[PDB]
Coordinates of C-alpha atoms and ligand atoms in Angstrom, one line a residue:
Chain A
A43 CA 63.5 -13.3 16.8
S44 CA 65.2 -12.9 20.3
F45 CA 64.8 -9.1 20.4
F46 CA 62.0 -6.6 19.9
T47 CA 61.6 -3.1 18.4
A48 CA 59.9 -0.1 20.1
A49 CA 58.0 2.3 17.8
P50 CA 59.0 4.1 15.6
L51 CA 61.3 1.1 14.9
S52 CA 59.5 -1.9 13.4
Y53 CA 60.6 -5.5 12.6
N54 CA 59.0 -7.5 9.8
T55 CA 59.3 -11.3 10.3
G56 CA 58.5 -11.9 6.6
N57 CA 61.8 -10.4 5.3
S58 CA 63.7 -10.3 8.6
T59 CA 64.1 -6.5 8.2
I60 CA 64.3 -3.8 10.8
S61 CA 62.9 -0.4 9.6
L62 CA 62.1 3.1 10.7
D63 CA 58.5 4.1 10.4
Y64 CA 58.1 7.8 9.6
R65 CA 55.3 10.2 8.4
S66 CA 56.2 11.0 4.8
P67 CA 54.8 14.6 4.8
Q68 CA 57.3 15.5 7.6
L69 CA 60.3 13.3 7.1
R70 CA 61.9 11.4 4.2
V71 CA 64.9 9.4 3.0
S72 CA 67.5 11.2 0.8
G73 CA 70.4 9.1 -0.6
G74 CA 69.5 6.6 2.1
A75 CA 69.7 9.1 5.0
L76 CA 66.9 10.5 7.1
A77 CA 66.0 14.1 6.3
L78 CA 63.1 16.5 6.7
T79 CA 60.5 17.2 4.0
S80 CA 60.4 20.9 4.9
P81 CA 63.6 21.8 6.7
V82 CA 64.3 25.3 7.8
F83 CA 67.5 26.8 6.5
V84 CA 68.9 30.3 7.1
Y85 CA 71.5 31.9 4.9
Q86 CA 72.5 34.9 6.9
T87 CA 75.2 37.5 7.6
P88 CA 77.2 36.1 10.6
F89 CA 76.6 37.3 14.2
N90 CA 77.9 40.9 14.6
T91 CA 79.4 40.7 11.0
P92 CA 77.3 43.1 8.9
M93 CA 77.9 43.3 5.1
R94 CA 79.2 46.6 3.7
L95 CA 77.0 47.6 0.8
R96 CA 77.7 50.4 -1.7
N97 CA 75.1 52.8 -3.1
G98 CA 75.4 52.3 -6.8
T99 CA 78.8 53.5 -8.0
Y100 CA 79.0 56.3 -5.5
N101 CA 81.4 56.2 -2.5
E102 CA 78.4 56.1 -0.1
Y103 CA 78.2 53.0 2.0
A104 CA 76.0 51.2 4.6
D105 CA 76.2 48.2 7.0
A106 CA 73.5 45.5 6.4
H107 CA 72.4 42.5 8.5
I108 CA 70.7 40.0 6.3
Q109 CA 68.6 36.9 7.0
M110 CA 67.3 34.6 4.2
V111 CA 65.0 32.0 5.8
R112 CA 63.8 29.0 3.7
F113 CA 60.6 27.3 4.7
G114 CA 58.9 24.9 2.3
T115 CA 59.6 26.5 -1.0
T116 CA 59.3 30.1 0.4
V117 CA 62.3 32.3 1.1
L118 CA 61.7 35.1 3.7
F119 CA 64.3 37.8 3.1
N120 CA 65.0 40.3 5.9
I121 CA 67.5 43.2 5.9
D122 CA 68.5 45.7 8.6
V123 CA 70.3 48.5 6.9
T124 CA 72.2 51.3 8.7
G125 CA 74.2 54.0 6.8
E126 CA 76.2 56.9 8.4
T127 CA 75.9 59.4 5.5
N128 CA 72.7 61.4 4.9
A129 CA 72.1 60.1 1.4
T130 CA 70.7 61.6 -1.8
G131 CA 67.2 61.1 -3.2
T132 CA 66.9 57.4 -4.2
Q133 CA 69.8 55.0 -3.3
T134 CA 70.4 51.6 -4.8
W135 CA 71.7 48.7 -2.7
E136 CA 72.6 45.5 -4.6
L137 CA 73.2 41.9 -3.4
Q138 CA 74.9 39.6 -5.8
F139 CA 74.7 35.8 -5.5
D140 CA 76.3 33.0 -7.6
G141 CA 73.5 31.7 -9.9
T142 CA 74.6 28.0 -9.6
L143 CA 75.6 27.7 -5.9
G144 CA 73.8 30.7 -4.3
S145 CA 76.9 31.9 -2.6
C146 CA 76.9 35.7 -1.7
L147 CA 79.6 37.3 -3.8
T148 CA 78.9 40.8 -2.4
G149 CA 80.0 39.9 1.1
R150 CA 80.2 37.1 3.7
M151 CA 77.1 35.0 4.4
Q152 CA 76.8 31.6 6.1
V153 CA 74.2 28.9 6.5
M154 CA 73.6 29.0 10.2
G155 CA 71.7 26.3 12.2
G156 CA 69.7 26.7 15.4
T157 CA 72.7 25.4 17.3
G158 CA 74.5 28.6 16.4
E159 CA 76.9 26.6 14.2
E160 CA 77.7 27.0 10.6
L161 CA 76.3 24.2 8.4
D162 CA 78.1 22.7 5.4
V163 CA 75.3 23.4 2.9
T164 CA 75.6 25.0 -0.5
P165 CA 73.1 27.9 -0.4
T166 CA 71.2 26.9 -3.6
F167 CA 67.9 27.1 -1.6
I168 CA 67.9 30.9 -1.9
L169 CA 67.8 30.8 -5.7
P170 CA 64.4 31.4 -7.5
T171 CA 63.8 29.6 -10.8
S172 CA 66.6 27.2 -11.8
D173 CA 66.1 28.7 -15.3
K174 CA 67.4 32.3 -14.9
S175 CA 64.3 34.1 -16.3
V176 CA 62.8 35.6 -13.2
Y177 CA 60.3 38.5 -13.0
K178 CA 59.7 39.5 -9.4
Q179 CA 59.7 43.0 -8.1
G180 CA 57.7 44.9 -5.5
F181 CA 57.5 47.6 -2.9
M182 CA 57.5 47.6 0.9
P183 CA 56.7 50.6 3.3
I184 CA 59.6 51.5 5.6
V185 CA 60.5 54.1 8.3
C186 CA 63.8 56.0 8.2
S187 CA 65.1 56.8 11.7
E188 CA 68.2 57.8 13.7
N189 CA 69.2 57.5 17.4
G190 CA 65.8 55.9 18.1
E191 CA 64.0 59.0 16.8
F192 CA 61.5 59.0 13.9
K193 CA 62.6 60.7 10.6
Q194 CA 60.4 59.6 7.6
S195 CA 57.7 57.3 6.6
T196 CA 58.7 56.2 3.0
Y197 CA 59.0 53.2 0.7
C198 CA 61.6 50.7 -0.4
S199 CA 61.6 48.9 -3.8
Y200 CA 62.9 45.3 -4.3
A201 CA 63.8 43.4 -7.5
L202 CA 65.1 39.9 -8.2
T203 CA 66.9 39.4 -11.5
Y204 CA 69.6 37.4 -13.3
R205 CA 72.5 38.9 -15.2
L206 CA 75.5 37.0 -16.4
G207 CA 74.4 33.8 -14.6
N208 CA 74.3 35.6 -11.3
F209 CA 71.3 36.2 -9.0
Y210 CA 70.7 39.8 -7.9
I211 CA 68.5 41.3 -5.2
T212 CA 68.4 45.1 -5.7
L213 CA 66.8 47.4 -3.2
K214 CA 65.8 51.0 -4.0
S215 CA 65.2 53.1 -0.9
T216 CA 63.9 56.5 -1.4
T217 CA 64.9 58.8 1.4
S218 CA 65.2 62.6 1.0
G219 CA 67.1 64.1 4.0
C220 CA 67.3 61.1 6.3
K221 CA 70.0 58.6 6.6
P222 CA 69.2 55.1 5.2
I223 CA 68.4 53.4 8.5
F224 CA 65.5 50.8 8.2
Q225 CA 64.5 47.2 8.5
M226 CA 62.5 45.7 5.6
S227 CA 61.4 42.2 4.6
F228 CA 59.7 40.3 1.7
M229 CA 58.9 36.8 0.6
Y230 CA 59.6 35.0 -2.7
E231 CA 59.5 31.5 -4.1
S232 CA 62.4 29.1 -4.7
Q233 CA 61.6 26.5 -7.4
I234 CA 64.9 24.8 -6.4
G235 CA 63.9 21.9 -4.2
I236 CA 66.1 20.9 -1.2
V237 CA 67.5 17.4 -1.8
Chain B
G42 CA 73.9 -11.0 25.6
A43 CA 73.5 -9.5 22.1
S44 CA 75.6 -10.3 19.0
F45 CA 75.2 -6.7 17.7
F46 CA 75.6 -3.1 19.0
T47 CA 73.6 0.2 18.6
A48 CA 75.1 3.6 17.8
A49 CA 73.2 6.6 19.2
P50 CA 70.5 7.7 18.7
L51 CA 69.7 4.0 18.6
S52 CA 69.8 2.2 22.0
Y53 CA 69.5 -1.4 23.2
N54 CA 68.1 -2.3 26.6
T55 CA 69.4 -5.7 27.8
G56 CA 66.6 -5.9 30.4
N57 CA 63.7 -6.3 27.9
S58 CA 65.9 -7.1 24.8
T59 CA 64.5 -4.1 23.0
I60 CA 65.9 -1.7 20.4
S61 CA 64.7 1.9 20.7
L62 CA 65.1 5.3 19.1
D63 CA 66.1 8.0 21.6
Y64 CA 64.7 11.4 20.6
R65 CA 64.2 14.8 22.2
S66 CA 60.5 15.1 22.7
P67 CA 60.2 18.9 22.2
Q68 CA 61.5 18.5 18.6
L69 CA 60.3 15.0 17.5
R70 CA 57.6 12.6 18.5
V71 CA 55.8 9.3 17.7
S72 CA 52.3 9.4 16.1
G73 CA 50.5 6.2 15.5
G74 CA 53.9 4.5 15.8
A75 CA 55.6 6.6 13.2
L76 CA 58.3 9.3 13.7
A77 CA 57.1 12.9 13.2
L78 CA 58.0 16.4 14.2
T79 CA 56.6 18.4 17.1
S80 CA 56.6 21.6 15.1
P81 CA 56.7 20.7 11.4
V82 CA 56.6 23.3 8.7
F83 CA 53.7 23.0 6.1
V84 CA 53.0 25.4 3.2
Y85 CA 49.6 25.6 1.5
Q86 CA 50.4 27.7 -1.6
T87 CA 49.4 28.6 -5.1
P88 CA 51.4 26.4 -7.4
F89 CA 54.6 27.8 -9.1
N90 CA 53.6 30.3 -11.8
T91 CA 50.0 29.5 -11.3
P92 CA 48.3 32.5 -9.7
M93 CA 44.7 32.5 -8.7
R94 CA 42.1 34.8 -10.4
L95 CA 40.2 36.9 -7.9
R96 CA 37.3 39.2 -8.6
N97 CA 36.5 42.5 -6.9
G98 CA 33.0 42.0 -5.5
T99 CA 30.5 41.8 -8.4
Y100 CA 32.4 44.3 -10.6
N101 CA 34.3 43.3 -13.8
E102 CA 37.6 44.1 -12.1
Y103 CA 40.0 41.1 -11.7
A104 CA 43.4 40.4 -10.2
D105 CA 46.0 37.6 -10.3
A106 CA 47.2 36.5 -6.8
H107 CA 50.1 34.4 -5.6
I108 CA 49.4 33.0 -2.1
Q109 CA 51.5 31.3 0.6
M110 CA 50.2 30.0 3.9
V111 CA 53.0 28.8 6.1
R112 CA 52.3 26.9 9.2
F113 CA 54.9 26.9 12.0
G114 CA 54.0 25.7 15.5
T115 CA 50.4 26.9 15.7
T116 CA 51.0 30.1 13.8
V117 CA 50.0 30.6 10.1
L118 CA 51.9 33.2 8.2
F119 CA 49.7 34.4 5.3
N120 CA 51.4 36.1 2.3
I121 CA 49.7 37.4 -0.8
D122 CA 51.2 39.0 -4.0
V123 CA 48.3 40.7 -5.9
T124 CA 48.5 42.2 -9.4
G125 CA 45.5 43.6 -11.2
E126 CA 45.2 45.1 -14.7
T127 CA 42.3 47.6 -14.1
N128 CA 42.8 50.9 -12.3
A129 CA 40.3 50.6 -9.5
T130 CA 38.8 53.6 -7.8
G131 CA 37.9 53.5 -4.1
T132 CA 37.9 50.4 -1.9
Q133 CA 38.1 46.9 -3.6
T134 CA 37.2 43.6 -1.9
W135 CA 39.1 40.4 -2.6
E136 CA 37.8 37.2 -1.0
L137 CA 39.4 33.8 -0.5
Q138 CA 37.1 31.0 0.4
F139 CA 38.2 27.7 2.0
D140 CA 36.4 24.6 3.1
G141 CA 35.7 24.9 6.8
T142 CA 36.3 21.2 7.5
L143 CA 39.2 20.3 5.1
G144 CA 40.7 23.7 4.5
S145 CA 40.7 23.2 0.7
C146 CA 40.8 26.5 -1.2
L147 CA 37.5 26.7 -3.2
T148 CA 38.3 30.1 -4.8
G149 CA 41.2 28.6 -6.8
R150 CA 43.9 25.9 -7.0
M151 CA 46.2 25.6 -4.0
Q152 CA 48.6 22.7 -3.0
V153 CA 50.5 21.6 0.0
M154 CA 54.1 21.9 -1.2
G155 CA 57.1 20.4 0.6
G156 CA 60.6 21.9 0.6
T157 CA 61.6 19.3 -2.0
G158 CA 59.2 21.1 -4.4
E159 CA 56.9 18.0 -4.4
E160 CA 53.2 18.1 -3.6
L161 CA 52.3 16.4 -0.3
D162 CA 49.2 14.3 0.2
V163 CA 48.0 16.3 3.2
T164 CA 44.5 17.7 3.9
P165 CA 45.1 21.5 4.5
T166 CA 43.3 21.7 7.8
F167 CA 46.4 23.3 9.4
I168 CA 45.3 26.7 7.8
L169 CA 42.0 26.8 9.7
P170 CA 41.7 29.0 12.8
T171 CA 39.4 27.9 15.7
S172 CA 38.0 24.4 15.3
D173 CA 34.3 25.1 14.6
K174 CA 33.5 28.4 13.5
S175 CA 33.4 31.4 15.9
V176 CA 36.4 33.5 14.7
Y177 CA 36.6 37.3 14.6
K178 CA 40.2 38.1 13.8
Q179 CA 40.6 41.3 11.7
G180 CA 43.3 43.9 11.2
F181 CA 45.1 46.3 8.9
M182 CA 48.4 46.3 7.2
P183 CA 50.2 49.1 5.4
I184 CA 50.9 48.5 1.7
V185 CA 52.4 50.3 -1.4
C186 CA 50.5 50.3 -4.7
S187 CA 52.8 50.4 -7.7
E188 CA 53.1 49.8 -11.4
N189 CA 56.0 48.9 -13.8
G190 CA 58.4 49.1 -10.8
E191 CA 57.4 52.8 -10.2
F192 CA 55.9 54.1 -6.9
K193 CA 52.1 55.0 -7.0
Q194 CA 50.6 55.2 -3.4
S195 CA 51.3 54.5 0.2
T196 CA 48.0 53.2 1.6
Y197 CA 46.4 50.4 3.7
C198 CA 44.9 46.9 3.3
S199 CA 42.3 45.5 5.7
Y200 CA 42.0 41.7 6.5
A201 CA 39.3 39.7 8.1
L202 CA 38.9 36.0 8.9
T203 CA 35.3 34.7 9.3
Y204 CA 33.1 31.7 8.9
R205 CA 29.9 31.7 6.9
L206 CA 27.9 28.5 5.9
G207 CA 30.6 26.2 7.2
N208 CA 33.4 27.9 5.1
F209 CA 36.5 29.8 6.2
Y210 CA 36.9 33.2 4.5
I211 CA 39.8 35.5 4.3
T212 CA 38.6 38.9 3.0
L213 CA 41.0 41.7 2.0
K214 CA 39.9 45.3 1.6
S215 CA 42.5 47.3 -0.3
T216 CA 41.8 51.0 -0.5
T217 CA 43.5 52.5 -3.6
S218 CA 42.2 55.7 -5.4
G219 CA 43.7 56.0 -8.8
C220 CA 46.3 53.2 -8.7
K221 CA 46.0 49.6 -9.9
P222 CA 45.8 47.0 -7.1
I223 CA 49.4 45.8 -7.2
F224 CA 51.0 45.0 -3.8
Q225 CA 52.4 42.3 -1.5
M226 CA 51.0 42.0 2.0
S227 CA 51.3 39.5 4.9
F228 CA 49.9 38.8 8.3
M229 CA 49.9 36.1 11.0
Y230 CA 47.2 34.3 12.8
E231 CA 46.7 31.3 15.0
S232 CA 45.4 27.8 14.2
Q233 CA 43.9 26.0 17.1
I234 CA 43.8 22.8 14.9
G235 CA 46.9 20.8 16.0
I236 CA 48.9 18.7 13.5
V237 CA 48.9 15.5 15.5
Chain C
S44 CA 70.2 -13.3 10.1
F45 CA 68.5 -9.9 9.9
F46 CA 68.7 -6.8 7.6
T47 CA 68.3 -3.1 7.9
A48 CA 66.2 -0.9 5.6
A49 CA 67.5 2.6 5.0
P50 CA 67.8 5.0 6.8
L51 CA 68.9 2.2 9.2
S52 CA 72.3 0.7 8.3
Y53 CA 74.4 -2.2 9.6
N54 CA 78.2 -2.2 9.6
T55 CA 79.7 -5.7 9.6
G56 CA 83.1 -4.4 10.7
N57 CA 82.0 -3.2 14.2
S58 CA 78.7 -5.2 14.3
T59 CA 76.8 -1.9 14.8
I60 CA 73.4 -0.8 13.7
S61 CA 73.1 3.0 13.0
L62 CA 70.7 5.7 11.9
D63 CA 71.9 7.5 8.8
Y64 CA 70.8 11.1 8.8
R65 CA 71.7 14.3 6.9
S66 CA 73.7 16.4 9.4
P67 CA 72.4 19.9 8.1
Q68 CA 68.8 18.9 9.0
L69 CA 69.1 16.4 11.9
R70 CA 71.6 15.7 14.7
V71 CA 72.3 13.9 17.9
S72 CA 72.1 15.8 21.2
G73 CA 73.1 14.0 24.4
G74 CA 72.6 10.7 22.4
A75 CA 69.0 11.6 21.3
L76 CA 67.9 12.5 17.8
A77 CA 67.1 16.2 17.3
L78 CA 66.7 18.8 14.6
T79 CA 69.5 21.1 13.5
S80 CA 67.1 24.1 13.0
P81 CA 64.0 23.2 15.0
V82 CA 61.1 25.6 15.1
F83 CA 60.1 26.8 18.6
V84 CA 57.4 29.2 19.4
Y85 CA 57.2 31.0 22.7
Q86 CA 53.7 32.5 22.6
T87 CA 50.8 33.8 24.7
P88 CA 48.4 30.8 25.1
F89 CA 45.4 30.3 22.9
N90 CA 42.7 32.8 23.9
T91 CA 44.9 33.9 26.8
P92 CA 46.1 37.4 25.9
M93 CA 48.6 39.2 28.1
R94 CA 47.5 42.4 29.9
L95 CA 49.9 45.3 29.3
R96 CA 49.9 48.7 31.0
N97 CA 50.8 52.0 29.3
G98 CA 53.5 53.3 31.6
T99 CA 52.0 54.2 35.0
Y100 CA 48.6 55.3 33.5
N101 CA 45.4 53.3 34.1
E102 CA 45.3 52.5 30.4
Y103 CA 45.6 48.9 29.4
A104 CA 45.8 46.6 26.4
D105 CA 45.4 42.9 25.6
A106 CA 48.3 41.5 23.6
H107 CA 48.7 38.2 21.7
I108 CA 52.4 37.5 21.2
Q109 CA 54.3 35.0 19.1
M110 CA 58.1 34.6 19.2
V111 CA 59.1 32.2 16.5
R112 CA 62.6 30.8 16.5
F113 CA 64.0 29.6 13.1
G114 CA 67.7 28.9 12.9
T115 CA 69.2 31.7 15.0
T116 CA 66.4 34.2 14.0
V117 CA 63.5 35.2 16.2
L118 CA 60.4 36.5 14.5
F119 CA 58.4 38.6 17.0
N120 CA 54.8 39.3 16.3
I121 CA 52.3 41.2 18.5
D122 CA 48.6 41.8 18.1
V123 CA 47.7 44.6 20.5
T124 CA 44.1 45.7 21.3
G125 CA 43.4 48.5 23.9
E126 CA 40.0 49.9 25.0
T127 CA 41.1 53.4 26.0
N128 CA 41.7 56.1 23.4
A129 CA 45.2 57.2 24.1
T130 CA 46.7 60.6 23.0
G131 CA 50.3 61.0 22.2
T132 CA 52.9 58.2 22.6
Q133 CA 52.1 55.1 24.7
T134 CA 54.7 52.6 26.0
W135 CA 54.1 48.9 26.2
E136 CA 56.8 46.8 27.9
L137 CA 57.4 43.1 27.9
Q138 CA 59.8 41.8 30.6
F139 CA 61.6 38.5 30.4
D140 CA 64.1 36.8 32.7
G141 CA 67.6 37.5 31.3
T142 CA 69.0 33.9 32.0
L143 CA 66.0 31.7 31.3
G144 CA 63.9 33.9 29.0
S145 CA 60.6 33.3 31.0
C146 CA 58.0 36.1 30.6
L147 CA 57.7 37.9 33.9
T148 CA 55.1 40.3 32.6
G149 CA 52.5 37.5 32.1
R150 CA 51.9 33.9 31.0
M151 CA 53.6 32.6 27.9
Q152 CA 54.3 29.0 26.8
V153 CA 56.4 27.1 24.4
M154 CA 53.8 25.6 22.1
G155 CA 54.4 22.8 19.6
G156 CA 52.6 22.3 16.3
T157 CA 50.5 19.6 18.0
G158 CA 48.9 22.4 20.2
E159 CA 50.7 20.9 23.3
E160 CA 52.9 22.8 25.7
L161 CA 56.6 21.8 25.4
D162 CA 58.9 21.5 28.5
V163 CA 61.6 23.8 27.2
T164 CA 63.2 26.7 28.9
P165 CA 62.6 29.7 26.6
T166 CA 66.3 30.8 26.4
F167 CA 66.0 30.7 22.6
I168 CA 64.2 34.2 22.6
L169 CA 67.2 35.9 24.2
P170 CA 69.5 38.0 22.0
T171 CA 73.2 38.3 22.8
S172 CA 73.9 36.4 26.1
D173 CA 76.1 39.4 27.3
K174 CA 73.9 42.5 26.3
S175 CA 75.8 44.0 23.4
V176 CA 74.8 46.2 20.4
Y177 CA 71.6 45.7 18.3
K178 CA 67.9 46.1 17.9
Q179 CA 66.2 49.3 18.2
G180 CA 64.0 50.1 15.2
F181 CA 60.7 51.3 13.7
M182 CA 57.8 49.6 11.9
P183 CA 54.9 51.2 10.1
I184 CA 51.4 50.3 11.6
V185 CA 47.7 51.1 11.1
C186 CA 45.6 52.0 14.1
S187 CA 42.0 50.8 13.6
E188 CA 38.6 50.0 15.4
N189 CA 35.6 47.8 14.6
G190 CA 37.3 46.9 11.2
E191 CA 37.4 50.6 10.2
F192 CA 40.5 52.6 9.3
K193 CA 41.8 55.2 11.9
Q194 CA 45.4 56.2 11.4
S195 CA 48.5 55.3 9.4
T196 CA 51.4 55.8 11.9
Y197 CA 54.6 54.2 13.3
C198 CA 55.6 51.9 16.2
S199 CA 59.1 51.9 17.8
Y200 CA 60.7 48.7 19.2
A201 CA 63.7 48.3 21.5
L202 CA 65.5 45.3 23.0
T203 CA 67.5 46.1 26.1
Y204 CA 68.8 44.6 29.4
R205 CA 68.3 46.2 32.8
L206 CA 68.9 44.4 36.1
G207 CA 69.7 41.1 34.4
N208 CA 66.3 41.1 32.6
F209 CA 65.5 41.2 28.9
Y210 CA 63.0 44.0 27.9
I211 CA 61.1 44.5 24.7
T212 CA 59.7 48.0 24.7
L213 CA 57.2 49.1 22.1
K214 CA 56.4 52.8 21.6
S215 CA 53.2 53.3 19.6
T216 CA 52.5 56.9 18.6
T217 CA 48.7 57.4 18.1
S218 CA 47.0 60.8 18.4
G219 CA 43.3 60.1 19.3
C220 CA 42.9 56.5 18.0
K221 CA 42.9 53.5 20.3
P222 CA 46.0 51.4 20.3
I223 CA 44.8 48.5 18.0
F224 CA 47.4 47.1 15.6
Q225 CA 49.5 44.1 14.6
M226 CA 53.3 44.6 14.2
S227 CA 56.3 42.3 13.7
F228 CA 60.1 42.3 13.5
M229 CA 63.0 40.0 13.4
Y230 CA 66.1 39.8 15.5
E231 CA 69.0 37.4 16.2
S232 CA 69.6 35.0 19.1
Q233 CA 73.2 34.2 19.8
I234 CA 72.0 31.5 22.2
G235 CA 72.2 28.2 20.4
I236 CA 69.6 25.5 20.9
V237 CA 72.0 22.6 21.6
Ligands
HG1 HG1 65.2 50.0 0.1
HG2 HG1 43.8 44.8 0.6
HG3 HG1 54.1 50.6 19.1

């Protein structure tokens, strides 16, 4: 009565209630707190902290920077591999995630905000299908290189699967004489909604 | 003065007795008196496990397509995951048709999906380039035809955005030779239509 | 003698009205509401491509450029289109201020989803505030013309600092085709939007 509300705040004299007006397609209320409808979350390898990946059961290794960007219900997966050995024929890199929480078991990953800071969010938003019966494989063209010099044009396979209640992303690069040094990216869908 | 206080981001001004929300204008804004984002993310996509059936020109070759169209800022990221059963030979033409005023996919069912998983009641105009119909964005993208998780071909896929008869078209021209049309591809384009 | 509807809350202990928000998605920044992971796009303006020169040659190209910040990731996308038929490798170079991020090569703007220009210093496009280690790489591309296939080939990218300025240097290798291609890559920005 003896105060007013500037938009987006509103007062209703009928029920004596102060409210926040918001556009529902962009923002929403979640357990009584304001949230976004389509927030951006990134589960990534930390700054300057690549993950060490093993080629199958061999004692061949590579350093990987990984970003997993959630927008809407899409996950954009991006990996920047860099091995020191000149590999074999096909090589198999495997990321393993907890099937309930999404936490990377293979190596250290963090939910990072735009502030730079680590967010206290369980990374379930990277999991496809809450039901563990997922299909999705595919190929992507890549370029093996070294010291900023072109080596090969070739391809990289990807596959998403569940085994023993754990989510796997399995990449199959096919080099021949070159080292496994390449960036690749793909998109997939997460049925798990962000609450 | 007042018999109450305001924690940030709420503020009280004792001069005009008014409660406000303080917000950073580059990130948030007010739109018809309601709070909104400056650069919201919207996705117009094929529904979960509900691919769209596309036909290759007038031929009896078909393909199932999952499609995502992600709006950030004024950029649209278009992603398609095709999978055909016939082995095509030569170039094949897949064509998506959208309403030129509303953006609604006429070719098959698509929905605006939020990050919650829920369908949003939003007209998909945010996927339209150039308000009113003189667009000429085309390009090529390299792809990999495959089958049963086994490598077939490295090849290319053309894309073109056009208007015809007040309708927005996205036309993809994959050039396989012996392989089935099975590939993911993605490109970015601009939408002049602001989300205001 | 008033109530608060969620997400507004009243605490009778300290007589204080608050906004409840989920901290992973929203936050307070100098007392104002903001996003945790806002989307910012530093781009060439609508219908305003940037004119790029191939080294010291009198060969030019028009480039549309988007630099999309999500979290701490920058997605870089360029759509080049030249009129000359180059032969051999060609070098396109984008130059940005190393402290502010402002494109020195040509006009770029922070554009919101509304279409409007945002008054934001484009520091969010800068990788590593003190030079460091990463981001040279290659990406496969397709040279074309008039919507007709020319070449499958490759494009190099490199992020470097020289004289306190951030450079993005693309090295397309055509051999008779015009330089007409889209390419995109991702990199990390240590500079937090705070
Ligand atoms: Hg690979
Ligand atoms: Hg195609
Ligand atoms: Hg290039």
